[PDB]
Design a protein around this ligand. Sequence first.
Ligand code: NDG
Ligand code: CL
Ligand code: CL
Ligand code: CL
Ligand code: CL
Ligand code: NA
Length: 129
Amino acid sequence: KVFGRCELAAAMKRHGLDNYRGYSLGNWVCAAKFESNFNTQATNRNTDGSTDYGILQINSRWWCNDGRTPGSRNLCNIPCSALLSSDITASVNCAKKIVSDGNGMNAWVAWRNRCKGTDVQAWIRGCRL
Ligand SMILES: CC(=O)N[C@@H]1[C@@H](O)[C@H](O)[C@@H](CO)O[C@@H]1O
Ligand SMILES: [Cl-]
Ligand SMILES: [Cl-]
Ligand SMILES: [Cl-]
Ligand SMILES: [Cl-]
Ligand code: NA
């Protein structure tokens, strides 16, 4: 599923991401925009053999199991394929664990590079919330 901007903002809010760990909703939408382009089926293979999955590009080295990342963890206790679903519940729950890990949203390098310090509220402007 390719989400609309305001549709994703609304689903992210309902799953409780708005101001999670102090990160306003626009931060999460911006991150999803640049990680996945709002596509829940997005995948990216990394040089270390791991793979990023889903609307928030959660990485198999630590957070999910895909059976092909040797010496990896599954801290969110899910199959990585659950992160590709049209329903973002697993992605949101796993993002809550990632962002609580000590480095906040810098865990998403696309967020640090492309969202941090910008006008992230613009990503939810004009949305019915
Ligand atoms: C939280 C998380 O797993 N982030 C990943 C991270 O591996 C990196 O920033 C990038 C690599 O392609 O994509 C994703 O954002
Ligand atoms: Cl915001
Ligand atoms: Cl594995
Ligand atoms: Cl959803
Ligand atoms: Cl923080
Ligand atoms: Na893993």
